[model samples]
Target: DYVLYKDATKPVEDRVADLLGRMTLAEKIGQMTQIERLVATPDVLRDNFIGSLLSGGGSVPRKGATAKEWQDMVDGFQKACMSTRLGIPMIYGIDAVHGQNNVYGATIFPHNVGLGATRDPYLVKRIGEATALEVRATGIQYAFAPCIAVCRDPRWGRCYESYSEDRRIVQSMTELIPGLQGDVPKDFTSGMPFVAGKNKVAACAKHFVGDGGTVDGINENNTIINREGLMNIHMPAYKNAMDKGVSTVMISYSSWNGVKMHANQDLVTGYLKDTLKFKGFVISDWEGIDRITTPAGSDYSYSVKASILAGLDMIMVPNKYQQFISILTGHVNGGVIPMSRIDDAVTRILRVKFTMGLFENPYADPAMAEQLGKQEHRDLAREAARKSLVLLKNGKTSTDAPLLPLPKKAPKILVAGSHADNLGYQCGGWTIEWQGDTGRTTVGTTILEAVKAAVDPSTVVVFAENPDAEFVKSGGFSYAIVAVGEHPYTETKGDNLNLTIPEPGLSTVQAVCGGVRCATVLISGRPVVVQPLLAASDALVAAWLPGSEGQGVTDALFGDFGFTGRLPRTWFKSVDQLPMNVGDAHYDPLFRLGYGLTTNAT
Candidate 1:
């Protein structure tokens, strides 16, 4: 009996039939709608009886709001919902895309592209666990994260959100699901370890269908893939996540052959809802259904019909909840939108709510919120940072005398480049802000700080920002470490055709390498075209947006930790050879996927 309800064998229809008998039509509709806090208040929650609420990207409770403040805000909203008839608890959602990134002072981990380079699934799972703790610390339950989009090209603005170009890599990393959902099932009364005094929240494996395989890698573009390509590449990771009991699936804004995923009945209702037998609810991405038409806008009547009919259990109508309610109510009354579709969507949402144990315990403990920025979580981040560094090229002479583990007590050491001491560049896009900031944006150890901290007190660590050749030569440095890569860019701004490191960064690398026996470290979200700069450095390290734990970079550099990161994406020799896979007709890379080398000298 313990396994009966939780087990996949038990019929979902039976669970649905039993649960449907207890709810009013208002509650059923409420279960199928999620509104934004900015748009809906406590009054709205009670009056309209909204099902769920979310804080969109860059949406916070208050300016300089602490974790405790967020908890109070969420708890206040939950209390408002409970006061209604039938007393259904509300679920709060946030974009915890990278380690509760929306919150200030929270540990902002590297984006999925960086995680891919590490190729350490175990470490990725731990990152998931740490992220769950931080999210729960803010009194939020659901996280729209672990986006398993199998992006083929780097030109997509959201490519950094994906883990790898290889589908197998994303498939293997589904271990993150259980880490976010907690080890124990909801039925268990107690005995689960109190991570920040709260159980882990549900995980969402998102953007269903081919979101990353669009032409020119454009966001929300049409995916021109055949059935074979769809099943073989894009669908594997979702299957893996479903098998691991992912609680939710976010529908993509993308289209397959010009059919929007939000309205693709065959894929959404037929395949995902029926064939896969996903027990969890399916939520829409931000305004995905509304963008189906030309000019890409939200139309309440049209969106409600298309999305609900396409098997979307919940619509993230972030704003404009009143219009959504009116449209759905009118459609149902007029028999335009079938009652069966509404029932189906509401039933699925209720099942997930029951399965998630929202009915029993919806309140988040305030004490848990206090532990948002704990050091142990930072240690886990450091561990991830150590494993995510990819060694691209260790030159011939560098093999004999590795540039890593540079003498900690060296009388003089030179750190030169635009990114040397900059936290903003290292953190990259989707940090505290959506686009991310420049300069010392927040409280964290920069790469320069990490390097200086690693060296002995007697060591003189000189930082030269965009230094000329003369300045580099005059430093009298034993060895130089040049940190350079793409600036903080996201979405449309980040898409690239050339995929080359900027000129100034390239010049800095050339200047530093020519001046002294040195190693070059490239900080980027993706593998860039490094052919021209490859031969100029004694050693090369790929630190893919390692976030604020600069100490982790120093840990590997000083032999405290060895280089264990393998490439998650292929290091193509040039852009012409892209969309290449392991078994492609012609496959060649500057460094092969899973390429990483360790130096004994270090």
Candidate 2:
């Protein structure tokens, strides 16, 4: 009866072997597919033999649900899965990319761009540790995080996900893996992946190889690079991740040269598995293979076969999973796809489950529910936010004065612009919703609120979403701080080459500066063309998607904290400097990669 797999006392390798021996072809196929939780019917996890469930952005048990409720919903899924013949545990995954971002009360940390500005591996690792606890609070045990892509272009929508344009920074941040999954064991070698301790969750080092180097910054487009160039820039991050025992590597939606990564056997199987010796499972991105074919299902069977043969151990089928199983089964049985491939996938999946101790404890721990948005986490988010701000300008003429470190007791102050009071704009994309939203979508103090709290009680603070010059002038305000930036977006939706402040943002900056001595804070995922705005303002700041903690902005602005951040990306002087970087042959930039001005901490 192969019951040794169910016994906790047995060696993990022995347990994995015993389980793999007993699983039927149907069950094994199911183990390789991951389904979106909402799309799955109540019986799907048990009846179809699915191995994993994911709650896509905004795929919650209910809107504004409590942490306990998340625990209950996830436990229900585990129960359904455990009742199956083998009684195997199904691992759950979520995008806790920056501090359990999907949950309502979860602490929203600064995006990777901000963290990169900090250049502190210790801090990123601690964020990862805190992120792991928040993820566990919601019953999720796997994080699709540490998006180690080294972005060479700012026009890429997902550039904000990358830590830097430099490979070394991305490599340094791999410490996040050990922080998410416990430390790398002393005996840990290259082949095996690990997640130590019960609280630690399995971590994924994502979108493997050259996703950030796509041509024209197109989302999921082709990246044309020679072997030396490709191996030089993109390959280093995966090697570091593997060394740290990262549990999984997500295949990029992008292509190498003209070939789709989902179908590239040489890179995915030959290089990653055979040469580099990466033993962790390879997973597909959201609808990764389906997106490869034009008419969705036109050549679905081919895509399935190609991706499997290319060394993708897990397919995030997302929806219509049955079709995948049906096609994959036919291919395996008909000799088009070998049985050994099926065994390989199953073996990897079981190894991860065994390593994670899922067989012993599959259900959520209700005690962890308190960790969602705990006070210490919020404080860390504030620290990250404050450290992310880079002072770009602070007066040019002899008569002009620095507008930052503004007096907290100023008689009358004006705070104006689109981003000033909006929580959704400050958090940017991949928040509660997939593309994110605008408004008070979650719990957080807006910049307006933070400014009010940072200032003296007796002082009058005037607020306007878009104030006219006349109103600003007539008020006789001491100074105005206008906040404006890009709207929430994800994937291709955020890709832009023009890169300019929009309607109300441009008008708002002009209005505030036209009337009074003002500071302009540009809120964006990357550097945008803002020459006129820079000239108009007495001071300028680059606040790159500082998530939910508005107090951090206030801390920097009010002199309670100094501006300690350096620019992680080069600020292009014009649109013509399309892809200028740190080591370009003809190097000329409005601001250098490491540019940042500082003020003493209060």
Candidate 3:
């Protein structure tokens, strides 16, 4: 007899029930498993009953893979998913934290740090929608983004991923949920929230609870905060996110009171799913399950047993799909993981799949790929970059004036610093790869080119990665705009006890400023110890890793746009003030939250 689940016109719940009832133990287990594209062969999806596939940072088809190529590859994975006995579609996930970061020509926007500084909810929501089109354009349906961690410390490497130290800002940014997952339809089913069309993609408010408040700002380390502190600072965003009907929430890698978040059934099941009533599935971060124990992979059996029971609907078991399925299968048979728990994960996964319209629209649409990094998206990115610039310092002295709307008609200009013309550095991490690469690795305008484009044709522009102090003194330059800051990094690799401008960054400031009047626009993830650079430069601008749209910086610098950004995180005076946040008792900061100077474009 034919099954109703096979029919598309049936009600979603009816289909989910019929399908779940029919899925064998292996198929049910497979729905909980997620694997990386590199390891997933065409036959592997059906052979293992795989639920999802993901492209890890640089896990692209090739370097500079075009939209068509990505569409073809991901579509191929989808085709494999459809070929299964039950023909269930598999979702492909990516860390598109900033635009379709893994794609060749996708419009990369400023990270959340810069976006947060803009403090414009409409623009942030627009960024979410814009990001959605590009992602679907490449056939990737899920993005591990709108990180939503209320970062309390600047020392964390992923601090740039959070919207603000203030949970309220993080709350406001939840508007991105409606943006990514299309706005909830008027008659939307109350318990289930999802994207309405293929035009938009799924949104994941990630790294679950307390990821931004780790002790000493250490990556993946314990948060060490009590339930009171945790509930106050970290819990607010999740409630708001659930309220927005976010499609999925990724569990954090960091722990609470020494409990690994991956194994925290109390919060994952109790707090989020039960109490908060988040209808969407809970997903784990990349390779998040393996890291539950000391020296990960030591005891796979216990990891699988604990994580599955913790209400993780989908596991980003990015690698070793066979091992994961085998272990989980054994756990289910051994009664260590009950069938009810397995059904819970699979049911949630199927509900999202149905809501994603994946059952009917399983393959990639070539027409949609055309929107990948279109001109319109870049313009939005430019607008984002324009609004995120924070004017930290204006002028060194009287008459030097606030070097920006930067005397747009200055006769001669010198643009110097490692970041001035480097595209990768400006885009920062999670671009083309996990940690991200350096140089013109992908598309976008360099701040130097943007500077030249913004200035009058008669103005002469010379650039130096590390300009000599003597050249600045003899070049007859009216003013120098030195763009300097840290290069690309992610996670713990980006953590530093002393956040300072790297070597030549300091030297670049001395030369450009000491040579003549100059403005130092810092291209960094967080506020670095820029006291010395601030002292020597005529002005300072915090351009927190403004992605690809270097022209946005120039737009603000040269009076095309006003400086609208505020400091999203507190700027510490020195490394000694490591954990200084907006509300500390010993709160001393060079620039406090909400501190920014405004300038009208002349």
Candidate 4:
């Protein structure tokens, strides 16, 4: 009979040895590779012997697939993998980076940048725990989460992906690992003092080394940093996460000192593996190894050799499975890539699988599927949304007392702009889709919906999706709330040389402010060029991607909750001050890193 850990009280090495004794070489290699579900079928999974499967950004189970359907899909794949010789169960992974974000009905929280503004690690840990629940609810056991990139420049499309420029903030939020791992300590500062479940999925502290310090903030560009600068700024968060028992580490596509992280043995094998004592296996990002050679063409043999030998335990061969398998096997047969290296990688992978208790419990809890997007999860998301709003500008006590806490009885309130009623722009990237969608993409309460629900039944809430001065004045409203920010963008489309809100959004802000006494809320991924309109608005709120929970914004606006979020990234005065720091050669910011003011009702 095949037994899982016949010796229950043995050391990990002995347990691993017993497991390895029962597996064939093919099964061992299968444990080290993961494929994307878009390209993976039951037949393909069985033929390729893929040990893991992942849903990439926007990759759902099937059209209109409910959370239960997602669980079934994952379970089906797991069954397919286990049907092979040795019956090893496959692990499923997804980019549940923010609140099981890829799922349509999952409770979407604010992006990491918004969370960082809260600067409360405990809250971040709670968000992680909540995210883990939603992810596991769909039968997935691994989440590519807690993106600990210390972004130095806002021009990077992924600026909103980072928590802070300061390493300390990143270090503090590293509590996400413990939260997701189900070992969160009571004394821990980042998350609520709660224990994670033993079955809670493993967390991957991703894009190891430097992803945020790319030149010109370009995605996958060279990250030129000195040794001291690298250790002090970029490496601390990984250290913190590792200490918290983060199970996996994903390699970055970016290079340090002209060496690609995927191919750099010195960093991956030497530093991270040997020196830092990272016992967990390292996986590649999507097509990370293929980009190693110039012009995007490289021999699969070279990719297999360089990456595997460089201490990469798993290759995310999302597509081109035959090529990877053939190349790796050919290299192993020809003595080019050592079989020992392959075994080592496979052994590390097996260790994690066993440690995760997958051998004994490959099946997901059928009840977990119902937990996805539950009301309680949405409530937690709402609380997180409320804390992420930073008060940027509130006018002095003038004739109307600095225009905040708008009266619930205000007869007519005009809600105007591109984002006022739009759920798409408000959620931004990495929502229902990887790049996010437009026009009621998912089920979530918009700012307009939340505001309308907040006031009296007799009070009128007029919405102008793209309003003009004539429309604004015709409403005869008490005050207008203009919601404006950058359009939904993901990956490279988000990259910018000039980090300014769109001209039309600025025009909308100017037009609305010119027409009515208005309170403006900038729903953006990061701080934009707001200098021009800073002096015009009575009150301004930086509502960074408040997902589906529009009541959180209303809570702050109606004085039920006070504005508490602080600036995660510095509010730069201009684009000239790109890569500005708090204690830099030139230290000047419109709003400092931790600057947020609370308003007192008149």
Candidate lDDT scores, in order, read 0.79, 0.87, 0.87, 0.81
List of clashing residue pairs for candidate 3: none
**Which portions of model 1 show Cα errors greater than 4 Å?**
1-19, 184-198, 298-300, 396-400
Per-residue lDDT of model 2, residues 1-602, tens digit only: 44899888898889888999999999999999899988776588888899888988888887788889998888888898899999878888898888888899889988898888888888888889999999998888899988998888889999889888888888888888988998887888875778875588999988977999998788899898898979988889888888888888899999989888988889988988888787778889988898677765589999899899988999998888889999999999899889899999888898888988888779889899999999899998998899889988877675765667888998999999999999999998888998879989888878999999989997899999898889998997999989999998888999988888677897898999999988888889888888888878888888888899989888999999888888888888986777777888977989888899888766
- Give the local distance difference test score of model 4: 0.81
Task: Work out the TM-score per prediction.
Answer: 0.93, 0.98, 0.98, 0.95
lDDT of 1 by residue, 1-602 (tens): 24333334455456556556666667678777799888867789988777899988678876568998888889999998988776667889888877887788888788888788777788888888888889888999888877999888877778878888899998887767777875544553221111112467878888898998888878788899899999999999988777667778999988998899999999988998778877678899888778876666646577778888888888898787777787878878888878788787777676666666666567887778866867888888887887788877666463475567667888899988888889888888877677777887666788889888889899899998777888888888888888999888776678788888776888888888888877788888787888767778888889888887888788887888778788887788888877676667888877777888875435
lDDT string for model 4 (1-602, tens) is 75645554565567777777776666667777789887888787787678888888888976456788888888889888877766677888898877888887888888888888888899888888888888888888888878999988888888888888888998898877777767745464331112234358878887888999898889888999998999998998988876677778899989999998999999998988777777767899888888787855456677788888888999898887778877777777888878788877877777677767677678778878877888887887788888888988777354556677777787888888788888878888987788987768776788899899888888898888778878777778898888888887777788898988876777888778877887788988777888876766778899888877778788788777778888888889998888887778897899989988776432
**TM-score of candidate 4 to 2 decimals:** 0.95
Clashing pairs in 2: none
The positional error of residue 366 in candidate 4, measured at the CA in angstroms, is: 1.5
Candidate 3 local Cα displacement, residue 543, angstroms: 0.2
For model 2, state the Cα shift of residue 106 in Å. Answer: 1.0
Worst ten-residue run, lDDT, model 2?
395-404
- Root-mean-square deviation of candidate 3: 1.3
State the lDDT of candidate 3 residue by residue for 157-178, as single tens digits.
9998988999888888888888
